[model samples]
Every structure is written in structure tokens, then in C-alpha cells.
Target: GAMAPSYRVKRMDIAKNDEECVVNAANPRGLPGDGVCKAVYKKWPESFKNSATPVGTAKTVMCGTYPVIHAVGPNFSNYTESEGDRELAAAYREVAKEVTRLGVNSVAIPLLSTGVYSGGKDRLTQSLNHLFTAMDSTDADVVIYCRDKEWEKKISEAIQMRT
Candidate 1:
């Protein structure tokens, strides 16, 4: 099953997954005090803290048996018109590359920059488009976990339009 060629999108809770690794939208500070990061910290504080480093924009950390992709997104305060779009796209591309390198069969990704990053719907849509585009040829199954109905609808529409 791991070798099967697949790519998909879904609206569900990322926490319910038992197979796919979780992707966390982290910052350079490595402060998992809110949103998905906080949840991950609560679940695996040591690994989460240990993964905290002032490295590049992205890093992979082990949380329990799952590998969480800690992607440091652009700060909301410095969110310019085109910077967010570029940064989000680059982050997703890096994520795709890392996942491919890790040889993971599946991964659960959230609508990055939407939570604490303060990105709005347009940014979310842009990020989704970029993510799907970057992972278009990846072997892993990408399940985008949308926590709200608005995001679910937008993401589904985006996927349909892209496909």
C-alpha cells in the first residue's frame, strides 16, 4: 500500500489519523503555545521541544511514532500582499520535498497560515493551490484536514478546479 501511487484531499480531523504523520505549522521561536502546535506539544512535549531549532523554514520532528513536519510560516505582522503567497508556496514545496525524502505513504496537512498566522480565506485558497501544485507528482497521499466548514468548502472547490 505504501508504494501505491496516490494523492487526495479530505476534510477531517487530523488527530484521528493513525497512519499518516501530522504536519505542524511552526514558527522560528518553536513556541507551541497555541493552535495545532500547542496540541502537538501537549501530546509530545519532549520531541516538540527538541525539534525547536532556528534552522531553515522547515524541519521534521518525531512525535511519538509519527513524524511531524514543522514548517515555520511567515509572520502575520509582516504579511505583505505577495510575501504571504510566495512564502506559503515555498513552505509547501519544501514540505513536499521533505515528505518525499522521508518516503512517507500519507500525511495530514492543515490550512497553513489560517490559524495563528492570521491569514484569511484568500490566503488559505492560495496556499492550498500552491500545496496541491507542489505535491502534484508526489507518491504520498495528501489529506488536507479542514477544521471548519468554510475551509472544507473552499478546499474542495479548489481541488475540483485544479483537477
Candidate 2:
């Protein structure tokens, strides 16, 4: 396997992260609402153009500073664990691919679909596993960021257990 990317979690809004690019855990329609999406929307409103990034795919919007990636994640309530895993995995994978394509040195991403979107506790480990593993292919340092403190342990435990 390729070397794992440098991985760490930070308790902060993604919009405020110092990374070269920050990812938005966006819906397919690219609607900017809760969680990190809200802050991302407020911070970079000029790029919200009513466009869409389908589930499991990501698109970049050049902004005032860092390029913001909107990775579409499935609403977990709408999928079984099998479906959720694949879609969520692809979402993270696409973010990694997009960053590599953009050639950014470091990237920040909020966990996708796990908040009001309800990706659920059941999927946390697998989701993070997919995220870290997918990101491992890239050269950039990766920060899995969040706004809450409780996620610090959850993210670290997942990283500790990664394959």
C-alpha cells in the first residue's frame, strides 16, 4: 500500500483552517446549510452558483484564497449500510483525488454526513477508515476537522485503528 498521508484531527471550523484547501461536506445539490457547510457558505458566498456535485463526486470552486471542494455525500437515512459505505467512501475518495489533481500541499475536511445529515454512529468507523485510506494516496498532509470537542477522541480512535 502507498504510505498513509499525515493525518490528524482539529477541533475547529473547516472554513478557518489554514490548509491550502478546505472541503465542504455538501449535499448533492450543493445546498449550504448545517455543520461545516454553514460556515463554508458564510465564508465564501460568492461561489454558491446553484450548481450540483453528485453523490460520491467533488468539485472545486476557486475562491478568494484556497480552493473550496464540495464533496457530495449521501443522506444516510436513505441508504443501507452497504450502500452508505460505498457512497461515503467514494465521497472521501473523490476529495482526495480532487486535492491531488489541484496539487495542494495540505487539506482540511470535515467528516461527511455524520451530523444533521445522519450518517449515524453505526457507520463512523468504516467511514473514517475509508476516509483515511483514501486520503493515504495523496502526498498532502490531511486534517480531519470539526467544530466540537467530542469528535477529537472519535477521530483519533479511528485513526489509531486504521488498516
Candidate 3:
């Protein structure tokens, strides 16, 4: 009952995760995205459509070989800080939902809302904790991918506070 799930942190692109499922921090418009999502869209424009998932939600779409869980995290400019926090965690929670539905034992996830999606560096620890806690409940092995060295270190700093 204490530690059924495993968590790992790596400073790499999520596309290299090699897990059964992966996550993308997406935009709400369902259009070709920007930043990380943009890269996925740019490369796989035909493999998957621009998803119309909204803030605080996630959906699974097939791209190439595996599934990418496209989730929309809130832009701080559009949501107040408190709502931003809720929306961020909700997005991760939905990721958990989609992963469990897939019946996969492992998933790779981007650090939600902490990307160019207003990449909430100030809420680094908070976002990691929420994301890890949500994924933990799915009983899956999780690899949290962040390419930034500083962010990886902050995730390390935050890891001390987790499951």
C-alpha cells in the first residue's frame, strides 16, 4: 500500500521515452500546436490531427507507432493563478485516466504546464508533485521527461518531497 508505483526523472525529449504511452503539453484550439507540441505536430502532421482538447483535459491520439496523450494545460494569461493550478493538475489527472484506459504499465509524461505553455517555473515543485501523485494512482511506471538542465535539477529538488 505504500509504494506501488515507480517514478523516474530524465533530462531528455519525451519522444525518446519508449513507454507504452506518452504525454504532450498541448493547446486548447486543437490546431497545430507550439513548442513541444509543435514539434510533434510538425513531424506527424498526417499521423494525427490537431486535437481540440480543452484546458484541464486530455485525450489519446495515435501518432506513428504509439499513442500520444494530448492534454491542454492552462495559459496563465487566460486563467487566474489558483485556477491555473487546478487546470494544471486536472490535465495530469486526465492523463492518468487515459493511461489507465489503455491498460499500460508505463507512461512517459512531460512536466505539465511547465513548458512554453507559460512554463510555470515558479510552480515547478507544485506541478511535479501534482503530476507524480496523479500518475502514481494509475499504478504505472512513470518517466518524467524534461530537457532543461535547470528544470531537471529543480525536479530533483522536488523529488525529495514525493512518493
Candidate 4:
């Protein structure tokens, strides 16, 4: 069977499955203390500890089978809306490139900055737009994991509009 790359949205845990790679919004300082990073760390502490090191914005780190993408955006402590958006977009683009380079077929991505960063609903929409634009051209089956039903619906609607 021939496997074609595709994109789909899922309302589930990003690290629950055996996807080739899972993208986590990480801090540039290599701390997986909160949000998806914390969850990933909890799931694979050894791997994360071994690979979790300081990285530039829009860069990446590999933890076991999961290639966590550092896509931290604006937070309450360090608020810079536009810079955060740019960083997120760059991270999404980098993810697309890295997955292709690694010859990975499946990837799971969380809505970056939508959690403790809390950039609001509109920011979530913008993040989706950036991610989809970057990944739309990739040949990987991407699964975007949403936080909840409302987010799932919003992401689904955004995908629909794009298509």
C-alpha cells in the first residue's frame, strides 16, 4: 500500500501514540517545566534529560523517537506578541523541514503557545494558519493535537476554511 502524506486534526494526547515524531513547544533555555514540554518530559524523562539542552528559537531537540520542536511564543512574563508569532511560524517551518530531513512519515503537533502562554483564541487561529502554511507542502502525515472540544472545533473549522 502506498502511503501518501496527509494532515488531520486530533483531539487527543500528542504523546499517547507511536508517531514517528511529536512536536512540543519548548523553551529556548531547555526547561520542560510546563505545558506540552512538561508532559513530554514526564513521559520520557531520561530521553528528555539527555537531549534537552538550550536551543535557539525555532530550533529543535530530539528525545527518543519524538523530535520536540522549540516553539515558545509570548508569555505573561515576557510579553511580545509579534515576536512570539514570528518565532512560532519559524518553528513550524523548521519542523516541516526537519521531519522531511529525518524521513519521518508521521508527526504530532500541539497548538503552540495556546496553553500557559495563553495568547487567546485569535492567537490560536493565527498559529494554526502559520503551522498549516508551513506544513501543507510537506510529505508527512501531520496530526495536530488540540487541547479540548472547543479548540478542536476551532482547529477543524480553520482547516476547513483553508481547504
- Among these predictions, the greatest TM-score belongs to 2
| Whole-model Cα lDDT of every candidate shown, in order | 0.70, 0.78, 0.76, 0.69
Candidate 2 vs 4: which has more TM-score: 2
Candidate 4 lDDT score at position 99: 73
TM-score of 3: 0.86
**Regions of model 2 farther than 4 Å from truth:** 1-5, 119-122, 160-163
- Predicted candidate 3 versus true structure: per-residue lDDT over 59-86, tens digit per residue: 7888766777888888876788889889
Candidate 2 TM-score, true structure as reference: 0.88
TM-score of each candidate structure, all chains considered together:
0.84, 0.88, 0.86, 0.82
Write the residue-wise lDDT of candidate 2 on 17-109 in tens digits: 878888888777777777778788898876567537788888888777668889887887888877877888889888988898888888888
> Cα miss at 110, model 4 (Å)?
0.5
Task: Report the backbone clash tally of model 2.
Answer: 0
Q: Model 1, 45-101: lDDT tens per residue?
A: 665655664322568877666788887666555677577667877777778887887
Clashing pairs in 2: none
In candidate 4, how many clashes are counted?
0
Q: lDDT for model 3, on a 0 to 1 scale? A: 0.76
What TM-score does candidate 1 get on C-alpha atoms? 0.84
lDDT of 4 by residue, 27-119 (tens): 666576786778777775654543443322344566655666555554534656666666667667777777777788788888766777764
Query: Considering only N, C-alpha and C atoms within 3 Å, which residue pairs clash in candidate 4?
Result: none
